[PDB]
Amino acid sequence: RSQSEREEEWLEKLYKKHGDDYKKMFFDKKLNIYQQSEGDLKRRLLRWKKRNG
Amino acid sequence: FVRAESIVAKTLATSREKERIKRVSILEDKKAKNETQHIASGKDFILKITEGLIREKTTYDGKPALLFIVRVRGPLAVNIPNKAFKILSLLRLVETNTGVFVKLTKNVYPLLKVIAPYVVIGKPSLSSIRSLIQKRGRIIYKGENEAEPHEIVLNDNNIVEEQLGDHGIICVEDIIHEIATMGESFSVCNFFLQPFKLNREVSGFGSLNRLRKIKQREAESRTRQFSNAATAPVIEVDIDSLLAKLN
Amino acid sequence: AIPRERVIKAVNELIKFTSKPLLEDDEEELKKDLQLIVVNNKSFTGTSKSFKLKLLNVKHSFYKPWKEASATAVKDFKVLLILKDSDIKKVSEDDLFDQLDSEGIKVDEIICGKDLKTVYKAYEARNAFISQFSLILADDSIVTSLPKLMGGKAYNKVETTPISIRTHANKEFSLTTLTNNIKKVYMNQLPVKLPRGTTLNVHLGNLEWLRPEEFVDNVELISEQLIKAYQIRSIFIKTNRSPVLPLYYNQDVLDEL
Amino acid sequence: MPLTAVPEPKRRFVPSKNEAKRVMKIVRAIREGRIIPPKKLKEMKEKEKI
Amino acid sequence: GYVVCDSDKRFLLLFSFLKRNQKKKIIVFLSSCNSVKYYAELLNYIDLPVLELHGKQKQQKRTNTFFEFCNAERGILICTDVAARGLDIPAVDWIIQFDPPDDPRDYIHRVGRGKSLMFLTPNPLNEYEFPENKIANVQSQLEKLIKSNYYLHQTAKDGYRSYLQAYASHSLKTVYQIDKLDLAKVAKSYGFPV
Amino acid sequence: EYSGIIYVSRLPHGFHEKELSKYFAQFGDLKEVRLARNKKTGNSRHYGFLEFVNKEDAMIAQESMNNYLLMGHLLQVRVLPKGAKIEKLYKYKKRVLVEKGITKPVKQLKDNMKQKHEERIKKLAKSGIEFKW
Amino acid sequence: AAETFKLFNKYRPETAAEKKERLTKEAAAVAEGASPKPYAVKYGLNHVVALIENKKAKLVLIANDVDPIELVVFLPALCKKMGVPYAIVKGKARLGTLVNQKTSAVAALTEVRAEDEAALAKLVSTIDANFADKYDEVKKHWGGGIL
RNA sequence: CCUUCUCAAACAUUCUGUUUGGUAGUGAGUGAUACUCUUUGGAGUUAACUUGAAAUUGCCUUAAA
């Protein structure tokens, strides 16, 4: 189950601006427009990281 | 019956207009007396808006220019003050949708800033002038034998002879000559065609005409602004385009 | 040139007057903090009640520690920027942070002329908006339009009335002209009004800021610019309702009356 | 108090996902070429009906 | 001794204190452990870096944060009544219990070990005269902030509820469900009492 | 009972005696109209009083204007009982400054300034402050 | 009524054409090369009587002419119960106009832009004084005794 | 039921710098010593704070029908 172009580019933005600070990453209004939890973010980023380097 | 809301709105708008006219009056009086010690600006800009709407900012030269002032009806709740009654009486523009020719000099330009929310100005072309005179034209003179106030039409050239004649003017095209080119007989013939009677835009209240008036009414505030400041740049518009709409 | 010794003696007497024998700081802290240097003249701007803020050049910033420990104070110090209708379409807050965090000043909110006449046009909404902010900056063009849009209560203070800032390089807007003029107004200038009467105080602010030797440099340069530009009568250093401190006293200006 | 103690959903605060569904449906339709974009629709009438 | 404040001006007055007393070491006590999960989220969000202590968090976190407060110089924590029992720090100047206490008698023993005061409009040392004008104007900022995060809507929901549930499970004649909910909601910033 | 004299408050920004007389004239013949204003500058306090020649006209106006949303704030109108007449409200314009200055000679005010300045240095010493010059 | 609509006309729900063109603008831009939640009037009876009792309604407008009268009979008194500042306005057609529908029966204003906030609060107070205070006798008194 | 004075020069080009001028404000009230003038009248200034735009009387016509 792969990821879409827009979802991948969204996770690119989150990682490049924050890195791994999931508290700060989910309290960001600009990138995390859908007010999603920490668990959703670490799961989706690891899917992004497995498909990349 | 007059509603309360309207009767307060009229005063609330004339407060802005009385204070605005006094403000422009002060800065123009202090500009002429060479007491430019502490005012906003001691010179005159002219805005030329053309057609995607480019706003130009050019200073007014001392050169005498030719303008065709067109009556607008604006703004909404305003009653005209004494300083507006005076200038619009001198230019004979009490009636809405009504044009007149005047030359623009260093004396004419300060009076232009007062009436700028009531008039729309601009330098016309040779075709705008020539088509306007051959399409519209009034002459106040005697009727059959008794009646005086008949204003009829520029049908003839022998009427032009009888009223002007000896000044060198013989025909309607000669009137167009002394209006397009600033000459000796311009003050003679300018008060001969007294004002013009331009038809209003859209010209109806109904199905198509209300919507077309809505479209044009929102186009007004885009193609014309009220500066309200004492250093108001005079808005010049295309009269070739405007009289294409009004002929 | 004014004697620096009498300035040192004045502020030392202000230290002694502030060191004297509730859970919030309603009045006690303000009367402790607020220094004002009085400047007297025979009829300042005698007939015209214009609201221009004279930007008196000072070597050392008092706005800087006013930021650093208004962070500790209940009333926060936040920097407002009133701009024109094309500027916010052109320039965001992020570019201001990009070029002003370099020295360490923060633009709180950027405000259009539209916003003061629609969203902040309600009187309580207007009052509660402006009274929050201490530094009010306004682009040169909008300054003349602002007595109507923000009202009279915004002008009764010295904080809430705007400072005319130039943002136009030959009438064309540029970010740089804003970037350096915000610096000059902030760190190198102290604003003060000019009433139509005789008395004028200069709100230097809190006594606690810039150790008294620096306060001498503040007062010195203020007199160096207010006696040169205008002929004046008297100068007094005053913390809120003290027995006054007569600093400068002139006897050659009154001869013309 | 209100009559019921019903917990407010995330979707009442978060940007709508139905809107996101519609947008990402029109996106497909533009890639496929079956919806001509609003920018090119002007160009189709600037060249025609003259 | 005590400060008299309404349920509107309750957290308003608390927030007014914590900014000015950033330099010092003060203690805030709540009844619920689900109330501190709200306050230690707001104050960290509006950048007053407070410390968080409650029953619902893990023991190693509860130890390694409270240890850091003991070795600090400038710090500030939020902890409950029951969790802070037996481990008190002398490095203190204000012991300020916000909610009504568990035992009205055992609180006297909690003090004489720091300055003590309470908050009571519905309900020795000196009282404190309070200025009405110099409260911080961060309420409508919080009202906008609550209805735009969800996480802080939920923590405020179970802040308000758990506080009021603990208020009803009291024993005194003073603390027996008298306080109206049109005031208590604005402490947690609401238009309706949840 | 009630009387012809009326009280109106919550008036619009720029609703003066000119428009109070003109609008309430349509209800009938009004006797005498005023509006309370500031003296420092000539502008309305947003409340005024007007009297009708007919008591019944006063109650009809009150019935129709008691809650009238008029440009951002609703008109409040109240009848008055027997007595409580319209007394002392004056038309105050914008008051201008008058330049009374010099009269006294320069040497009089100079030594007056010397007296006030030396006493000023002798004022700080009264309350715990010592300052040179 | 005119002053209620001078506010309510500023919150027309985005018409089917306007919504379609904007969401194709989203597609034509975003697929090739942040916004706040927008405020509109709320207009279904299931949804209005949902919003009252939430309690999210600041002004609930009720039509006087409804096809079965029995539909909207509880609503003014449920609004007086909840403390929702209601106004029975004249015409379901007139409510229909501000809402892209032929008829609406009910229109509500939950949230608002801050420019319109003070006007809305005053609209509440004007309606409280004009409507609820003049018609405190209307909870009493059987109507229709006209000879 | 209209919406508000939305920029100019003189010098200087460091990719915009300096200098000069431009704003008359809802009302009502609380308020702790100082400033000059005037000759007794406040004249005009000087911190700050309160407030749903609050309030009981200081001697042109096609923007129509």
From Swiss-Prot, chain C:
A single MF term (Gene Ontology): large ribosomal subunit rRNA binding
Primary residence: nucleus
Source taxon at top rank: Eukaryota
Signal peptide extent: none
BP GO terms, sorted: maturation of 5.8S rRNA from tricistronic rRNA transcript (SSU-rRNA, 5.8S rRNA, LSU-rRNA); maturation of LSU-rRNA from tricistronic rRNA transcript (SSU-rRNA, 5.8S rRNA, LSU-rRNA); protein catabolic process; ribosomal large subunit biogenesis; rRNA processing
GO CC, alphabetical: nucleolus; preribosome, large subunit precursor; proteasome complex
Subunit structure: Interacts with CDC4, PRE4, PRE6, RPT1 and SCL1 as part of the fully assembled 26S proteasome. Interacts with pre-ribosomal particles constituent NOP7.
Miscellaneous remark of the record: Present with 45900 molecules/cell in log phase SD medium.
Role description: An adapter protein that specifically links the 26S proteasome to its substrate CDC4 which is one of the substrate recognition subunits of the SCF E3 ubiquitin ligase complex. Required for turnover of cell cycle regulatory proteins CDC4 and GRR1. Required for synthesis and nuclear export of 60S ribosomal subunits. Required for vegetative growth.
Name of the protein this chain belongs to: Proteasome-interacting protein CIC1
Gene symbol of the encoding locus: CIC1
Shown stretch of the complete protein: 31 to 301 of 376
Swiss-Prot record, chain D:
Name used for this protein in its record: Ribosome biogenesis protein ERB1
Function: Component of the NOP7 complex, which is required for maturation of the 25S and 5.8S ribosomal RNAs and formation of the 60S ribosome.
Section of the entire sequence shown: 254 to 303 of 807
Location(s), subcellular: Nucleus, Nucleolus; Nucleus, Nucleoplasm
Oligomer and partners: Component of the NOP7 complex, composed of ERB1, NOP7 and YTM1. The complex is held together by ERB1, which interacts with NOP7 via its N-terminal domain and with YTM1 via a high-affinity interaction between the seven-bladed beta-propeller domains of the 2 proteins. The NOP7 complex associates with the 66S pre-ribosome. Also interacts with NOG1.
Note: Present with 2680 molecules/cell in log phase SD medium.
Protein source organism: Saccharomyces cerevisiae (strain ATCC 204508 / S288c)
Family: Belongs to the WD repeat BOP1/ERB1 family.
Curated annotation (Swiss-Prot), chain E:
Written domain comment of the UniProt record: The Q motif is unique to and characteristic of the DEAD box family of RNA helicases and controls ATP binding and hydrolysis.
Location in or out of the cell: Nucleus, Nucleolus
Residue ranges of the motif Bipartite nuclear localization signal: 9-25
Coiled coil: none
Assembly information from the UniProt record: Interacts with RRP1. Associates in the nucleolus with the 60S and pre-60S ribosomal subunits. It has also been isolated with the nuclear pore complex.
Function recorded in the entry: ATP-dependent RNA helicase involved in 40S ribosomal subunit biogenesis. Required for the processing and cleavage of 35S pre-rRNA at sites A0, A1, and A2, leading to mature 18S rRNA.
Posttranslational modification: Phosphorylated by CDK1.
Protein name (Swiss-Prot/TrEMBL): ATP-dependent RNA helicase HAS1
Impact reported for P49S: Decreases the amount of 40S ribosomal subunits at 37 degrees Celsius
Family: Belongs to the DEAD box helicase family. DDX18/HAS1 subfamily.
Remaining remarks: Transcription depends partially on SET1.
Domain Helicase C-terminal: 1-146
Swiss-Prot record, chain F:
GO terms, molecular function: ribosomal large subunit binding; RNA binding; rRNA binding
Gene Ontology BP term (one): ribosomal large subunit biogenesis
GO cellular component, one term: nucleus
Entry keyword Nucleus: yes
RRM domain residues: 4-82
Membrane-spanning segments: none
Main subcellular location: cytoplasm
Subunit structure: Component of the pre-66S ribosomal particle. Interacts with NOP7 and RRP1.
Protein name (record): Ribosome biogenesis protein 15
Gene: NOP15
Residues of the full protein shown: 88 to 220 of 220
